[PDB]
Enzyme design. Structure first.
Site, short mmCIF file in Angstrom:
data_model
loop_
_atom_site.label_atom_id
_atom_site.label_comp_id
_atom_site.label_asym_id
_atom_site.label_seq_id
_atom_site.Cartn_x
_atom_site.Cartn_y
_atom_site.Cartn_z
N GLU A 9 -9.66 -4.79 10.36
CA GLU A 9 -9.08 -3.62 9.67
C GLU A 9 -10.16 -2.56 9.56
O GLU A 9 -11.18 -2.79 8.92
CB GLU A 9 -8.53 -3.96 8.26
CG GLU A 9 -7.66 -2.82 7.67
CD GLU A 9 -7.10 -3.09 6.29
OE1 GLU A 9 -6.89 -4.28 5.93
OE2 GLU A 9 -6.87 -2.11 5.53
N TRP A 54 0.10 -10.14 3.23
CA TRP A 54 -0.58 -9.46 2.11
C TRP A 54 -0.06 -10.04 0.78
O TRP A 54 -0.84 -10.38 -0.12
CB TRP A 54 -0.23 -7.97 2.11
CG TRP A 54 -1.07 -6.96 2.87
CD1 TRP A 54 -1.72 -5.87 2.33
CD2 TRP A 54 -1.28 -6.85 4.30
NE1 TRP A 54 -2.31 -5.12 3.32
CE2 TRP A 54 -2.07 -5.70 4.53
CE3 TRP A 54 -0.87 -7.62 5.40
CZ2 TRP A 54 -2.46 -5.30 5.83
CZ3 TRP A 54 -1.26 -7.23 6.68
CH2 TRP A 54 -2.05 -6.08 6.88
N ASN A 61 -4.56 -11.34 3.25
CA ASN A 61 -5.29 -10.06 3.42
C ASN A 61 -6.18 -9.64 2.26
O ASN A 61 -5.69 -9.40 1.16
CB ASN A 61 -4.32 -8.91 3.70
CG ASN A 61 -5.06 -7.62 4.00
OD1 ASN A 61 -5.78 -7.54 4.99
ND2 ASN A 61 -4.90 -6.62 3.14
N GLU A 62 -7.49 -9.53 2.51
CA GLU A 62 -8.46 -9.08 1.50
C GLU A 62 -8.42 -9.86 0.19
O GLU A 62 -8.72 -9.32 -0.88
CB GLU A 62 -8.33 -7.56 1.26
CG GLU A 62 -8.57 -6.77 2.56
CD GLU A 62 -8.62 -5.26 2.40
OE1 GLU A 62 -8.14 -4.72 1.37
OE2 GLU A 62 -9.16 -4.60 3.33
N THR A 88 0.82 -1.24 0.00
CA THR A 88 0.00 0.00 0.00
C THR A 88 0.85 1.29 0.00
O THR A 88 0.56 2.23 -0.75
CB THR A 88 -1.13 0.06 1.07
OG1 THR A 88 -2.13 -0.93 0.77
CG2 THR A 88 -1.81 1.45 1.05
N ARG A 140 -14.58 4.65 4.73
CA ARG A 140 -15.32 3.43 4.35
C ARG A 140 -16.10 2.85 5.53
O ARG A 140 -15.51 2.46 6.53
CB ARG A 140 -14.36 2.35 3.82
CG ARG A 140 -13.52 2.74 2.61
CD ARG A 140 -12.60 1.62 2.15
NE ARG A 140 -13.32 0.34 2.11
CZ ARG A 140 -12.78 -0.82 1.76
NH1 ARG A 140 -11.51 -0.90 1.39
NH2 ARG A 140 -13.54 -1.92 1.75
C1 LIG Z 1 -6.72 -2.36 4.29
C2 LIG Z 1 -5.34 -2.81 3.85
C3 LIG Z 1 -4.36 -1.76 3.99
O1 LIG Z 1 -3.04 -2.20 3.55
C4 LIG Z 1 -4.72 -0.54 3.30
O2 LIG Z 1 -4.67 -0.79 1.90
C5 LIG Z 1 -6.09 -0.04 3.68
C6 LIG Z 1 -6.57 1.13 2.90
O3 LIG Z 1 -7.77 1.68 3.35
O4 LIG Z 1 -7.07 -1.18 3.53
#
Ligand SMILES: *[C@@H]1C[C@@H](O)[C@@H](O)[C@@H](CO)O1
Ligand SMILES: *[C@@H]1O[C@H](CO)[C@@H](O[C@@H]2O[C@H](CO)[C@@H](O)[C@H](O)[C@H]2NC(C)=O)[C@H](O)[C@H]1NC(C)=O
Ligand SMILES: *[C@@H]1O[C@H](CO)[C@@H](O[C@@H]2O[C@H](CO)[C@@H](O)[C@H](O)[C@H]2NC(C)=O)[C@H](O)[C@H]1NC(C)=O
Ligand SMILES: *[C@@H]1O[C@H](CO)[C@@H](O[C@@H]2O[C@H](CO)[C@@H](O)[C@H](O)[C@H]2NC(C)=O)[C@H](O)[C@H]1NC(C)=O
Ligand SMILES: *[C@@H]1O[C@H](CO)[C@@H](O)[C@H](O)[C@H]1NC(C)=O
Ligand SMILES: [Ca+2]
EC number: 3.2.1.46
Length: 640
Positions: free
Chosen positions: A234, A111, A157-158, A69, A356
Site C-alpha cells: 500500500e 479490512w 489490513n494495518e 475509509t 507519507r
Molecule cells: C491505507 C488503507 C487505505 O484504506 C487508506 O486508509 C489509506 C490512506 O492513506 O491507507
C-alpha cells in the site's frame, strides 16, 4: 558520469508487478453506474494492455460490512449461515480487469469483518478456524461463481496479525484445494512480521511475501535477511495532480533501488468516491461523476505506463540500478529473451511529495547521463524512446535511438521532473478515446423509487454507505412497497475504522446548502426502532463519527428528534409523533438558511427551527442502531 548496465555478473531480483487497490473503502463506488461507453473506456485506461496504466496487479478489499475509509463494502456473509457472492462491485471489477488482461494478478485483503465472527467480541482471532473459514469462503466463491483465481491472500489490513491464524489459514487453504494461493503478511509495518519470520521456521514456511505499507522507499535488515519477496503493498495515497504523479514516478523506481521492493501497489485504483470524503481524488485517475460521464485521465496513469507497458511480472531487475549524480534514479530490467527496459526519473522535491512520509529537501539539477551496455546488452542496436514532462507533456513517443558505433553507449540531457523509458519493445502506445462530457454537479432534482426487479448491483446507484450496509430489497407480500432499499446489518462489525453508532448512507452534492429531502421509511424493530433522513451532512468515511448537519429522527416509541450531529448529542428540536414500528411513513425535511422544517405524511410536524448557518453537505438516510429498516421513494431537490 557514465552508468554501466550489465548482466555478466548476474541479475538482481525478479520483478513482481505494479498494481493498485480497489477498496478500503468503497473507492470504486461511483464507477459502477457510469453509462457506456465511458465505463468501458475508464476500465481500458486502467487494465487494457499497451494502452493506459496497463496494470499488472489488482488488489481488492474483502468487504466486511465495516467503514474502511470512504464507505463500507458489503460482505459475502452478513450473518452466520448467510452466503452471497454477488454483493458489491469487486467481483465485477476483477472480471472486467481479467477480460482485458487474462494474466492480471489478483489479491484480496480484509479490512473489517462481520460482527458475528467475533462470537461476542470485536476481535477476529477468538476462533481462528472460523475466521479462516470465512476468508477461504471468499476465495472459493471467486472461483466457483466468477471463474477468478485469487493469487494472494492477506491477513488484516494495518492491524495485528496472529501467527497461529496465519498457520491455520495456510492449512485451511491447502485443505480446500487452494495450495496455489500464496500468503502476504502483514500489510502493516516491517515489524513485527520480519523478525517473527526469522524466529519461527513454521511461520517462515507459510508466508510467501512481506507486504509493508508506506515504507518511504526503504526496508529493514530483518526483511532482507528473510529472503522473502518484499512488496510495498500500500503506497501513493496522494492527490492525482502533477504532484501525485511525481510521487508515483519517484517511488516506482526507488522502492526497488532503495528498498529491494519488487512490487508497488497504489491506494487507490480510481477515484470514484465523492471528493469531499477522506483523501479525495487520490486514485491513479478520476471518475467521480457517473451522472455526467465526465472522467479524468490523470497524469499518474501515464507515469504507470512508463513502467507497466514495458515490463511484466517475471522479468528481472539488473544488478545495475541506482541514483543519478545530480538527483533522480534509473532502473533497468530484462526478460531473459533479449529485451531491455530502462526507466529514468528526475523528480524534484517540491513536485513529488507523497503524503507519507514527507521527505527532507533534496536537490535535482540539469545533468548529462551516459549509459553503456555491457554483457549481453552490448549487442543491442536500437531503442524505442518514451518521454513525459510533469508540471505538461504526457507519454510522448520520441525518435528512436540508434546504437551503431559499436560502442554500446549513449548519452542523454536530463532536466527536472522528467521520465524516460528506453526499451527494445515496439508495443508501446498512448491509448486514446475522445474526450468524455464536461463535468457537471450532481442533479439538483433527483429521485429513486428502487423499482428494479433484477438489479445488476446489490445497491442503488449513488448511495455511498458510511456505516451499515444498504441493499435493494424485494418484498413480494407488499404491492406499494414491493421494491425498497433496506439496511441489512443487525450488529456492529469487527470494525477497522471508528464506525458510527447509527447507520448512514450519503448521496448528492457536498456543496448543497439549501435542500428538501423526502423519503418513505419503515421501522422493523418494535418499541426501540428508529430511522432518519438528513441534509447538509459534512463528513463521512473514516471521519463518519464527526458528521454534523440536520438530522430528522423518528422512533417507534412515538417520538421525534432533530439533531445537529449524527451522534445525536446536540438537539435542535424534539417532541412526540404518531409513529410506530412496521408502518410506512413519508418524511420530509426542508432546510433553507438558518431554518428547517419537518413533515410527517405531508403534514407539518415542526417548522422554523433554527439551525447552524452557513453549512453545506450531502443528503442522507439511516437507522438509529444496527437494525433492519426500509426506505422507498427517495427524492431530493437542492441548491448550491
Ligand atoms: C491505507 C488503507 C487505505 O484504506 C487508506 O486508509 C489509506 C490512506 O492513506 O491507507
Ligand atoms: C538490497 O538492495 C541493496 C541496495 O539498495 C543491496 O545492497 C548493496 O547495495 C550496495 C549499494 O547500495 C551495492 O554496492 C552492493 O553490491 C549491494 N550488495 C549486494 C550483496 O549486492 C542488496 O544487494 C539488496 N539485498 C538483498 C538482495 O538481499
Ligand atoms: C522481446 O519480447 C517479445 C515479447 O515476448 C519477444 O517476442 C515473442 O517471442 C516469443 C518466443 O520467445 C514468441 O512466441 C512470441 O510470439 C513473440 N511475441 C512477439 C509479439 O513478437 C521477443 O522475442 C523478445 N526479444 C526481442 C529481441 O524482441
Ligand atoms: C440558501 O437560502 C438562504 C436563505 O434563503 C439564502 O440566503 C439569502 O439570499 C438572499 C438573496 O441572495 C439574501 O437577500 C438573503 O439576505 C440571504 N439570507 C441569509 C440568511 O443569508 C442563500 O443565498 C441560499 N443559497 C443558495 C445556494 O440557494
Ligand atoms: C542544487 O544544486 C545546484 C548544483 O550543485 C546548485 O547550483 C543549487 O544552488 C542547488 N540548490 C539548492 C537549493 O541548494
Ligand atoms: Ca419502490
Amino acid at each position: 558520469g557514465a552508468y554501466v548496465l550489465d548482466d555478466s555478473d548476474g541479475l538482481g531480483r525478479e520483478f513482481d508487478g505494479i498494481g493498485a487497490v480497489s477498496g478500503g473503502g468503497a473507492t470504486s463506488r461511483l464507477l459502477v453506474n457510469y453509462p457506456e461507453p465511458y465505463r468501458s473506456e475508464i476500465l481500458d485506461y486502467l487494465f487494457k494492455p499497451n494502452f493506459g496504466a496497463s496494470l499488472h496487479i489488482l488488489k481488492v478489499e474483502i468487504g466486511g460490512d465495516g467503514q474502511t475509509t470512504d464507505g463500507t463494502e458489503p460482505s459475502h456473509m452478513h450473518y452466520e449461515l448467510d452466503e452471497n457472492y454477488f454483493r458489491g462491485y469487486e467481483w465485477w471489477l476483477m472480471k472486467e480487469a481479467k477480460k482485458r488482461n487474462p494474466d492480471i494478478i489478483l489479491m484480496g485483503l480484509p479490512w473489517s469483518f462481520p460482527g458475528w465472527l467475533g462470537k461476542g467480541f470485536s476481535w477476529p482471532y477468538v476462533n481462528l478456524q472460523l475466521t479462516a473459514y470465512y476468508v477461504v469462503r471468499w476465495i472459493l466463491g471467486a472461483k466457483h461463481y466468477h471463474d477468478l483465481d485469487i493469487d494472494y491472500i492477506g491477513i488484516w489490513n494495518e492491524r495485528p496479525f496472529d501467527a497461529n491464524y496465519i498457520k491455520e489459514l495456510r492449512k485451511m487453504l491447502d485443505y480446500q484445494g487452494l495450495q496455489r494461493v500464496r500468503i502476504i503478511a502483514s500489510d502493516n509495518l516491517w515489524e513485527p512480521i520480519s523478525s517473527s519470520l526469522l524466529l519461527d521456521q513454521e511461520l517462515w514456511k507459510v508466508v510467501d511475501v512481506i507486504g509493508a505499507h508506506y515504507p518511504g522507499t526503504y526496508t529493514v535488515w530483518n526483511a532482507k535477511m528473510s529472503g522473502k519477496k518484499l512488496w510495498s503493498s500500500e503506497d501513493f495515497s496522494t492527490i492525482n495532480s502533477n504532484v501525485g504523479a511525481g510521487c508515483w514516478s519517484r517511488i516506482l523506481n526507488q522502492n526497488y533501488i532503495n528498498g529491494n521492493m519488487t512490487s508497488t501497489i497504489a491506494w487507490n485504483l480510481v477515484a470514484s468516491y465523492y471528493e469531499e470524503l477522506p483523501y479525495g481524488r487520490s486514485g491513479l485517475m478520476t471518475a467521480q461523476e457517473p451522472w455526467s460521464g465526465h472522467y479524468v485521465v490523470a497524469s499518474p496513469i501515464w507515469v504507470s505506463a512508463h513502467t507497466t507497458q514495458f515490463t511484466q511480472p517475471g522479468w528481472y531487475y539488473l544488478k545495475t540500478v541506482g541514483h543519478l549524480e545530480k538527483g533522480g534514479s534509473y532502473v533497468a530490467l530484462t526478460d531473459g529473451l533479449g529485451n531491455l527496459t530502462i526507466i529514468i526519473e528526475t523528480m524534484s522535491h517540491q513536485h513529488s511529495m507523497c503524503i507519507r512520509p514527507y521527505l527532507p529537501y533534496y536537490n535535482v539539477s540539469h545533468q548529462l547521463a551516459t549509459f553503456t551496455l555491457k554483457g549481453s546488452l552490448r549487442e543491442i542496436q536500437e531503442l524505442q524512446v518514451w518521454y513525459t514532462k510533469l508540471g505538461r507533456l504526457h507519454f510522448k513517443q520520441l525518435d528512436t535511438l540508434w546504437l551503431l558505433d559499436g560502442s554500446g553507449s549513449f548519452t542523454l540531457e536530463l532536466e527536472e521532473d522528467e521520465i524516460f523509458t528506453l526499451t527494445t519493445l515496439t508495443t508501446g502506445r498512448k491509448g486514446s478515446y475522445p474526450p468524455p462530457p464536461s463535468s457537471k454537479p450532481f442533479p439538483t432534482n433527483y429521485k429513486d423509487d428502487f423499482n428494479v426487479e433484477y438489479p445488476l448491483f446489490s445497491e442503488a446507484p449513488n448511495f455511498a454507505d458510511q456505516t451499515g450496509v444498504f441493499e435493494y430489497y424485494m418484498n413480494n407480500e407488499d404491492r406499494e412497497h414491493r421494491f425498497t432499499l433496506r439496511q441489512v446489518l443487525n450488529q456492529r462489525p469487527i470494525t477497522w475504522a471508528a464506525d458510527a453508532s447509527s447507520t448512514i448512507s450519503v448521496i448528492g452534492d457536498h456543496h448543497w446548502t439549501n435542500m428538501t429531502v423526502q423519503c418513505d421509511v419503515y421501522i422493523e424493530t418494535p418499541r426501540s426502532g428508529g430511522v432518519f433522513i438528513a441534509g447538509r451532512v459534512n463528513k463521512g468515511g473514516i471521519l463518519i463519527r464527526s458528521a454534523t448537519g440536520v438530522f430528522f429522527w423518528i422512533f417507534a416509541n412515538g417520538s421525534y428528534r432533530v439533531t445537529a450531529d449524527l451522534g445525536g448529542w446536540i438537539t435542535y428540536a424534539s417532541g412526540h409523533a404518531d409513529v410506530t414500528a412496521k408502518r410506512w411513513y413519508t418524511l420530509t425535511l426542508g432546510i433553507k438558511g438558518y431554518f428547517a422544517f419537518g413533515m410527517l405524511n405531508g403534514t407539518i410536524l415542526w417548522k422554523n427551527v433554527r439551525v447552524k448557518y452557513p453549512g453545506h453537505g450531502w443528503a442522507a438516510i439511516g437507522t438509529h442502531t444496527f437494525e433492519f429498516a426500509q426506505f422507498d421513494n427517495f427524492r431530493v431537490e437542492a441548491a448550491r
